[model samples]
Target chain A: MMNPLIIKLGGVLLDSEEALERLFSALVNYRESHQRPLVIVHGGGCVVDELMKGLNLPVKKKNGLRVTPADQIDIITGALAGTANKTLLAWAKKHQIAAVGLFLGDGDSVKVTQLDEELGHVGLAQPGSPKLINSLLENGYLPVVSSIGVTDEGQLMNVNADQAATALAATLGADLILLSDVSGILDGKGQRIAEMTAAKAEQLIEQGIITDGMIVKVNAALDAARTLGRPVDIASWRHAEQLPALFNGMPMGTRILA
Target chain B: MMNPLIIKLGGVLLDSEEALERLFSALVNYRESHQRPLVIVHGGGCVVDELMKGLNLPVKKKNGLRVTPADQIDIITGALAGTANKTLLAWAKKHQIAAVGLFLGDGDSVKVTQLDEELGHVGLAQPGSPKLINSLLENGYLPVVSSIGVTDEGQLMNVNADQAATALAATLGADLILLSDVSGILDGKGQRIAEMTAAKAEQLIEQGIITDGMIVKVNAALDAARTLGRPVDIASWRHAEQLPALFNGMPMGTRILA
Candidate 1:
């Protein structure tokens, strides 16, 4: 009975200096107190933005979604999976949190298949295998994962961190998957939605209220809940420490249930 | 033929905030004037020290070298390869330098085999072939290489920055490898030595004057000269602009030749 938690850290968190420091510090404190097993999956949005702009590479997101290209995959994989991986680990160290930065491709930790060449290296993590994450957790350290996975032939692919985290959460059958964000998910009235279910989540999506990136987050939450039967909480990173309260059924942000 | 230049950035440059800013700015300017195919391999002594201390890990080196253990591989890799990789990229972006970070395991850019398991993920880069470095340079961008490599099986290894830089320089048949530091290499009189041949370098090493980590630097320099016909220059990073001067055959820090 390990206290397992899958945490999906966004690119926004890594991009901001102040935010990164604060978030890392909070994570260290949480680990110190709870001593729970934490697994982190991070994105490289800012790095992608910079590389894309410089290369004059038009970011083509088919069907209103950003479709990652091959060159883009090279840039993102190198920067996030290679470089940004270190920055997060260093920050964690500065805050006294023992963290090991790893790419999902290492040790075949997360098996992924390319969704399509149109989306370049973007793919989904296969379900129901917690070997890598479990080993990392059992060693009493945090696994700061990069959103890059390997093909069966050992080629690397970029993954949406949100989807990867959810897949890992579902696979591990963890107690919680905390989707930390800059702002809490909001409703049509611009107020924070404290709770919701898979059915209600679909209704909101159909109504066009939750669109774009938020849509990706909510859908991943639904997937995790539906497949793993674990609770998923979308909460403001500013209130990350309130995780204990949320897990205790106090309610916060938007909770997507099965 | 591509004008390949191996740029060795000092660990101290990354240690000081003001120095790092100025050096990065200067590098951007240098790239504009020279526009040669360049590869940047940086050391992470200071940052590694801070991380190793913070993690309560033993930070000791046998014969004045960082003794990397298997568990410590993750720690050091995360700090040096990880931190230095991202920090350098961010600095490049700030100065508008079109630089891309490359990990040893990236497409197996550089391959090495284990010398000792206790050295953890440490190995020497297999000689011959510089496909990745060539492609990076040919693309008219800087390759920000981390001082690490990979085995054929894709295990990460710790490579001495000087060795890796020189190896890469020779592999690419580069003009020269610039070994930057706080100060240029000194002679027996404690004055900065201006020049030396591979033969003279051997004599100095036989004596105790060129000892410790400097021994590694000298060995790599001599190896580059003998094997790859590339000259190595030991210079101060604070005088980064002098890199061009060193390369141009002007009198500069200790020059090792065959």
Candidate 2:
């Protein structure tokens, strides 16, 4: 099978149905018109935060990463793997798309290493077998994956969605697209940069051109670009209409050069 | 692949790690010692109730099935597909077992029909293609499934776990085990019945010889037995140690003869 075009979504996508339907409808149109397959990897921070806030669970983070408390693993897993993943599948069903809900670790799709004991059950995704996702794609079903991972010993760990999608893209050698609210990687002048490199991206950080949370996403996408020996795209979810163009290699988002 | 053993669990199994470890360890040993494959279908009423109670969501039932409000679908999905299924996977991971988490509809594992419009998103399981399960079992991975289902039009509907397991067993021609707290079907005189038939069982109900929630379970198992053209076992999770004997065709609990 040809490599799947991997699309990643931010946490906010799970917040509403109309928003999901708009994007899902675009995916359906593109999938119908093109023979290429698609795999969706999503982040569920907003989803998890809503549950935690409802339960009055404390939230904490370190060095720009969430600190997953051991006690909250089940809650977090439900938020990402359960609610967030299935929500996508439900909407996919609406558009007559064949969708299967999955997490990062299903069928050993991704393996992980705990960054630190203090981070509790948080993980960084490494390559795992692409057999499961490939199997799904071969059958013409879209695999909607959440950012929850499992360790070799069976611990449920929270993974960064960008990191999960990137690892999957690298493992499958698939094209990568990280979708957020922003149009693409913007320069200090607030203009979209059509292409980027590690040399230029790193320089932008200290130059304060790429600051705040967007840098986290930029760094992950850059790593994916480096690993796959191909450019990775950083696109906006609002530009979902460009899905077919993205798949056809039109490059609507910021494409990072390895 | 030969038919896989379908084990059904009540919601209480998700409340404790020790209980889960005991059963998971037993499953691990059995899988290690046999060529037989396994599939787990779970009910998350207790898991869902815990979440709903925590959030102060109202619980309602009609004709013994839950009334799934549209707004509550995501929360319930997280409870069953997210927390319950992944919790089982995490434990399966602990025992060096390969486990994949799924809902009933993944890869069209089960097709469902909504029971009633008034029931919101409730469904009754129907036969679906077994390709996904067969593939996973072919690779020696145990599938831990939640009762969450999706309608043909893409609605996420709540499915009865026992119903899901029975439908799956019927479709796969698999051995079925319905695990509960009770030892099995005891006669009105307080004796453990080794075997039963539909005639004897249905009569016992009207005779007031069979009563309460156990009847609901007995009836479902009876239907499974008829469908599979063999006896269906109704065992207790506490008897997890007897998993080998059960899998090897030495029935442990009450066996419902078709």
List the candidates' TM-scores in order. 0.56, 0.93
TM-score of 2: 0.93
Per-residue CA lDDT of model 2 for A83-124, tens digit only, reads: 888878877777777778888778788888786899899998
CA lDDT of every candidate: 0.66, 0.82
Model 1 chain B: worst 10 consecutive residues (lDDT sum): B102-111
**Clash totals for all candidate models:** 4, 0
- Docking model 1 quality class: incorrect
What does candidate 1's lDDT look like per residue over B168-199, in tens digits? Answer: 67667776655566455787888988777766
In model 2, where do residues sit more than 4 Å from their true spots? A187-191, B186-191, B207-213
When candidate 2 is compared with the true two-chain complex, its DockQ is: 0.73
Candidate DockQ values, in order, are 0.05, 0.73
Report, for candidate 2, the interface RMSD.
1.2
